[PDB]
């Protein structure tokens, strides 16, 4: 079938959904695409190239709150950005695993530069803004990965743990995520406010 | 060589370090152990059983701050617990990937019950204590996974991003981690303090 970049990526996401990350392979991608393996190699050199591309494209397709609204607070932007990031990572099987350890792509440069500038224009040093952005990224990735890999795994408890497991089993993870997110955002705010005060 | 549980686990961690998680296999474990594959199967049924075991044993061996000190504050316990958790996850290649989505093992029941009880004895509802514990777990896992998978990957920047990448490349990740951790802990504290007040 068609082997332009857009089409190869569509097929790879479809396969990622069916097989997960560890099961995703170029041989299986060639099969899905109805092509021989040397044909594929012309377009896709290895699994890493594919993974890097999929991490960019998953956000390009499903991460719709990458930029703050006009007049939006930094707190609100981090909240909205994190919810959007989480949704995007949850959309394909092992999506968060595909996103791990990637670095900004050239096609994302304008966008993440704006993100970083925004934090600095709200009083953060680049480092402190970066640390806030990174903590949000990390917390969100961890929460999605635990949620997803828990599912992968599924394929005389003491009382508080029993109840804790009931609590976790009662929700997809969004409740704990949204709660932890408010804690994180407010902690950043306390830090930012304090300036040189002992806090 | 010897195939008791302890020995199989030693070999599997050694192999995890050499090959990472996706490359870890029972065939390769059998090779390391100097045994045939049906011999191994008697002791280890599949890769999942091995992964579940390794997640328990990595913490058993290297997570030394699982319990609060006498009179220790909940803030200090979460801090100390998180640093210890992070160190443990960093000790083997893809350690954090091995830990993902696991649930408490029977051998950890006493310990995590104590953790949960401790939070409740400091004023948290079980749910809020759980949400705090989970946010710490998630933030720490995400930060370790990004650090580690970044390394795996390695095998006209705009100015703020250039500097941000210099900042990240200058440290192993501990600085941003410790900073984000204080933000998280203080956010929990603000929440706990507020009780029914609008906050
Ligand atoms: C907070 N939120 C989840 C962010 C986001 O919305 C992104 C996006 N594509 O819109 C990221 O790329 C974002 O998710 C993300 O992945 C970010 C990063 O990876 C980095 C890295 O690795 C190094 C320097 C700077 C960044 C960053 C500023 O681009 C990060 C922004 C992250
Ligand atoms: C915060 N810190 C990293 C904790 C920890 O020190 C643990 C340990 N072995 O000592 C965990 O097991 C700990 O790391 C961890 O993994 C915990 C959990 O997985 C769960 C799950 O999944 C469900 C209910 C309860 C727990 C928990 C209370 O046992 C969690 C405690 C985590
Ligand atoms: Cl076609
Ligand atoms: Cl074509
Ligand atoms: Cl492959
Ligand atoms: Cl021996
Ligand atoms: Cl033996
Ligand atoms: Cl295997
Ligand atoms: Mg990233
Ligand atoms: Mg866990």
UniProtKB/Swiss-Prot annotation, chains A, B:
Transmembrane keyword on record = no
**Xref: InterPro entries:** DNA-bd_HTH_TetR-type_CS (IPR023772), Homeodomain-like_sf (IPR009057), HTH-type_TetR-like_transc_reg (IPR050109), HTH_TetR (IPR001647), Repressor_TetR_C (IPR004111), Tet_transcr_reg_TetR (IPR003012), Tet_transcr_reg_TetR-rel_C_sf (IPR036271)
Which positions, given as ranges, span the membrane? none
- Per UniProt, what is one GO molecular function of this protein? transcription cis-regulatory region binding
Q: How does it assemble?
A: Homodimer.
Keyword terms: Antibiotic resistance, DNA-binding, Magnesium, Metal-binding, Plasmid, Repressor, Transcription, Transcription regulation
Pfam families registered for this protein in UniProt: TetR_C_1, TetR_N
Question: What Gene Ontology terms for biological process does this UniProt record contain?
Answer: negative regulation of DNA-templated transcription; response to antibiotic
Induction comment from the UniProt entry of this chain: By the [Mg-tetracycline]+ complex.
Q: What does this protein do, in the record's words? A: TetR is the repressor of the tetracycline resistance element; its N-terminal region forms a helix-turn-helix structure and binds DNA. Binding of tetracycline to TetR reduces the repressor affinity for the tetracycline resistance gene (tetA) promoter operator sites.
Chain residues that bind Mg(2+):
99
The Swiss-Prot or TrEMBL record marks DNA binding at 25-44
Q: Where is the signal peptide?
A: none
Query: What protein am I looking at?
Result: Tetracycline repressor protein class D
Q: Which of this chain's residues are annotated to bind tetracycline?
A: 63, 81
Q: Which residues form the HTH tetR-type domain?
A: 2-62
The protein's organism comes out as Escherichia coli
rRNA-binding keyword on record: no
């Amino acid at each position: 079938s068609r082997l332009n970049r857009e089409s190869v990526i569509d097929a790879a996401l479809e396969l990622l959904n069916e097989t997960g990350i560890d099961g995703l392979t170029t041989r299986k991608l060639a099969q899905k695409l109805g092509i021989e393996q040397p044909t594929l190699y012309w377009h896709v050199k290895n699994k890493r190239a594919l993974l890097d591309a999929l991490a960019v494209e998953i956000l390009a397709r499903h991460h719709d709150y990458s930029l703050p609204a006009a007049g939006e607070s930094w707190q609100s932007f981090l909240r909205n950005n994190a919810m959007s990031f989480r949704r995007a990572l949850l959309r394909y099987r092992d999506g968060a695993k595909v996103a791990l350890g990637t670095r900004p792509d050239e096609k994302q440069y304008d966008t993440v530069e704006t993100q970083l500038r925004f934090m600095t224009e709200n009083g953060f040093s680049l480092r402190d803004g970066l640390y806030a952005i990174s903590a949000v990224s990390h917390f969100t990735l961890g929460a999605v990965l635990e949620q997803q890999e828990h599912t992968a795994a599924l394929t005389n408890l003491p009382p508080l743990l029993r109840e804790a497991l009931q609590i976790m089993d009662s929700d997809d993870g969004e409740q704990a995520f949204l709660h932890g997110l408010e804690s994180l955002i407010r902690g950043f705010e306390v830090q930012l406010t304090a300036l040189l005060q002992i806090v």
